């Protein structure tokens, strides 16, 4: 049973900005949703820097994806973010990536950002 996170505005305040990662996966082919227990990533720059790298995020997600495989679940290979993917601050403001696929998040104020949407995936083999 997987319970998602609360809206940023409802979460308790932190003293070290972090990215809440609540995404779902979409099986290429069947397009079925795959629920993953949300996790967190720490930030430090502008701990993952305040200048995030697409390939990095996907790597974090892929690691978490195979860390939750229960006897009945199969392994999935993260393919890429669906056009669905969005990173927001507590107000819903969206941050966009550059051409090199890098997203840069504010240093101050300290707060948390949310990465939601889907991640395209295929069963490993």
């Amino acid at each position: 049973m997987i319970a998602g996170p609360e809206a940023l505005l409802d979460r308790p305040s932190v003293n070290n900005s972090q990215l809440v990662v609540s995404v779902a996966g979409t099986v290429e082919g069947t397009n079925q949703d795959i629920s993953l227990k949300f996790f967190e990533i720490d930030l430090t720059s502008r701990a993952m820097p305040h200048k995030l790298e697409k390939a990095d995020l996907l790597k974090a997600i892929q690691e978490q994806l195979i860390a939750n495989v229960h006897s009945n679940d199969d392994y999935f290979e993260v393919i890429d973010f669906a056009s669905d993917a969005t990173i927001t601050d507590r107000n819903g403001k969206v941050y966009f990536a550059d051409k090199d696929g890098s997203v840069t998040l504010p240093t101050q104020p300290v707060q948390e950002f949310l990465l939601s949407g889907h991640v395209r995936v295929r069963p490993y083999k």
């Binding site: 979409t26 397009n31 697409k54 993917a85 969005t86 966009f96 997203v103 395209r120």
Partner: protein, 248 residues
Amino acid sequence: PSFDCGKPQVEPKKCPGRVVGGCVAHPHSWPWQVSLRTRFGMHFCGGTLISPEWVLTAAHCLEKSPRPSSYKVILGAHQEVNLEPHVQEIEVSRLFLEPTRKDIALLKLSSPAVITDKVIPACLPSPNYVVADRTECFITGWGETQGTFGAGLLKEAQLPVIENKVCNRYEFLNGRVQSTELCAGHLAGGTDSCQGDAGGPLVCFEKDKYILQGVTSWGLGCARPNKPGVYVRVSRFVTWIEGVMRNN
């Protein structure tokens, strides 16, 4: 046959149906795609190139200014903001609002468009034609702007047409669709279909080319999961279109 409408010079990815988020399209695999922009230069609506001098769009997009000098067009583009070098920027000369329903409009280019392999018109359909239920079509555009990755890249989604008879059932559009409009989407296991811009194109491949069957509607064009989207049924206006181009 030195570039006929409906024939892309870069095979389209043809994103499968129900793919969450849709797909970024192969650059220039939709040469008729238009980007209607303001004088200042901001992208705000879609269009379909129907001939070297004519762009078909949604009337609603013209709401702000009647002066055709307040509009510019971007042809051959893939990127929404940062524009490529080859992109063609043609200003608009006259605006033609369709009389009977005032939903679509015709844009005449101040000067024709150099038909290249990145800029090819779409084919209009036969008057009063009715695309069969289930026909696979495509919508393309820069309609979606919430993704953090790929922001700005032309995207595509595949939508099968929904017979108005069905489209209008209580669960769906509940009698809101005239014969002058058509529907496309999925009624089950479907997802958001908001990649197209208002005025954006909805084309359906036929035998060997892509025919413009619908114009993405303002507002109702962007449907939520398992709800079909509503497009102006271009066939019901080809005659008027043919006539405007033929007399101007």
